[PDB]
């Protein structure tokens, strides 16, 4: 109901966790679990590559169609572009329904 | 200079003419040429089939581009469409330069 | 117009960038982008190997030609050489037009 593709078997959850590296244990045995760990974080790169099937249009429509366009009118910032502080912003929600089809 | 394709050998001229069908000549010989012809015209259909080579675009441009679109704002007549009298009209000249390319 | 070789397809741009390595994120989730990165730079070596085609001269000229030469007159510094501070300098612009050819 939020829009999208209903999948009985969706793309699976990809779960990630730093392995606990303990600090130095006591030189005598303690049966209690470790509460002291070396503080650490991880970083790295992640790649997703999705292949999408397209459905081309076969309209015999004469007049031109509504399409998503940028405006040529000047502005302080180009849409879908970083500003002078390096902050990327998206100005408006772009839906996907621009071409037409007869019922 | 009016725009278009300069061709040393352009598509050739296709010339068409009704053959003169004379009216009844005099029953005696006259060496003068015929000035009296049966009034007639011709009609028919004409087909031109041109194949055009395209040049697809390879821009790595991030932001959206200016494109030719119809406006969705309502009007008494749809653009590039006959009116109530059956008269087809073209409202504006459409040029061909809408995509961009770097120098 | 600044001189040189006009190329429709020139040698391509070679673009280089340090990958951002973040500092430690907050232990709670924040949907804001990272503004804190580990300060780092890179260094290394770069090699360019260009092959040049030459065009040898076939003059039947009798007298000797103007050529680019160094002067033998003594000076505090040799031309196109570091000074006592290790600073390399080029004393004059050397053009390439020294041999002659008839029109």
From Swiss-Prot, chains A, B, C:
Signal peptide: none annotated. AAV capsids serve as viral gene transfer vectors that have been shown to affect long-term gene expression and disease correction with low toxicity in animal models, and are well tolerated in human clinical trials. It is found in: Virion; Host nucleus, Host nucleolus. Belongs to the parvoviridae capsid protein family. Capsid protein self-assembles to form an icosahedral capsid with a T=1 symmetry, about 22 nm in diameter, and consisting of 60 copies of three size variants of the capsid protein VP1, VP2 and VP3 which differ in their N-terminus. The capsid encapsulates the genomic ssDNA. Binds to host cell heparan sulfate and uses host ITGA5-ITGB1 as coreceptor on the cell surface to provide virion attachment to target cell. This attachment induces virion internalization predominantly through clathrin-dependent endocytosis. The N-terminus of VP1 is sequestered within the mature capsid. It contains a phospholipase A2-like region and putative nuclear localization signals. The ratio at which VP1, VP2 and VP3 proteins are synthesized in vivo is about 1:1:10, which is the same as in the mature virus particle. This is Capsid protein VP1. It comes from Adeno-associated virus 2 (isolate Srivastava/1982) (AAV-2). The chain holds residues 633 to 735 of 735 of the full protein.
């Amino acid at each position: 109901l939020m829009g999208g593709f209903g999948l009985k078997h969706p793309p699976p959850q990809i779960l990630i966790k730093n392995t606990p590296v303990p600090a130095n244990p006591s030189t005598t045995f303690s049966a209690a679990k470790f509460a002291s760990f070396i503080t650490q974080y991880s970083t790295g790169q992640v790649s997703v590559e999705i292949e999408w099937e397209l459905q081309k249009e076969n309209s015999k429509r004469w007049n031109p169609e509504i399409q998503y366009t940028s405006n040529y009118n000047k502005s302080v910032n180009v849409d879908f572009t970083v500003d002078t502080n390096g902050v990327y912003s998206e100005p408006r929600p772009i839906g996907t329904r621009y071409l037409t089809r007869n019922l």
